[PDB]
């Protein structure tokens with residue numbers, strides 16, 4: 001759901017601005033995580049974090065801990081996927097926006 | 110560990126959702142609350158929450174912890 005891919009991109013950009021967090025300096029990292037969130041949202045109904053493995057994804061989405069923005073990000077601003085990085089982080093660039101073109105390249109592959 | 114246990118946050122845990130410090134960094138170390146849940150499964154299906162101990166504090170505030178960050182009062 002390409003509408004969902006665009007909705008997820010907008011979410012990421014708005015959430016980064018609201019939390020004073022920044023995207024990875026390598027925006028393809030960001031794009032891969034945004035595409036995984038959308039994929040999960042299409043498959044499972046919720047944006048289950050894409051940079052983890054699970055024993056039971058349906059149970060995870062019901063529990064809600066790892067649905068984006070996850071518990072660790074909401075409470076401690078910790079994002080294991082490196083989608084939302086605090087300004088001090090070595091991998092933080094300066095963008096809080098990602099060109100749609102960049103996500104389209106990840107859909108291309 | 111049990112639901113209902115009183116615990117003290119003994120590790121330094123910096124959070125951003127406290128109702129008195131909305132959006133700003135606040136260390137919960139030293140605060141005391143009660144265990145409200147220990148997340149190990151959702152309807153019999155093991156789940157992977159990595160901050161499984163949900164602790165309720167005063168002022169309608171709750172936060173999640175690893176078992177090693179809290180101490181049974």
Ligand code: SF4
Pocket residue numbers: 033048049050051066067068069070071073078079080081082083084
């Ligand atoms: S670690 Fe949390 S905030 Fe980061 S992409 Fe995964 S679910 Fe979203």
